[PDB]
């Protein structure tokens, strides 16, 4: 994931890989999933590697 902030701005994002469904799980606890946190102060590129999770 790649973004490009000018240093006059502020804020952050979150990028979580979720298997199967965006089900009734809480939005406030998405950090349990393999994720990466963006921030306009620190960094602009995150990367995630995941194995194969499926029922067949």
């Amino acid at each position: 994931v790649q973004i490009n902030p000018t240093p006059f701005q502020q804020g952050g994002l979150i990028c979580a890989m979720v298997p199967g469904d965006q089900s009734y799980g809480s939005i406030a606890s998405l950090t349990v999933y393999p994720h990466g946190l963006l921030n306009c102060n620190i960094n602009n590129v995150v990367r995630i590697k995941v194995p194969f999770i499926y029922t067949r």
Binding site: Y24, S26, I27, A28, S29, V32
Partner: peptide, 16 residues
């Protein structure tokens, strides 16, 4: 202790 919530959908968020 937890106080966050969301409107769409109507839910009270929880910590782990």
């Amino acid at each position: 202790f937890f106080q966050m919530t969301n409107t769409n959908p109507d839910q009270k968020c929880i910590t782990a």
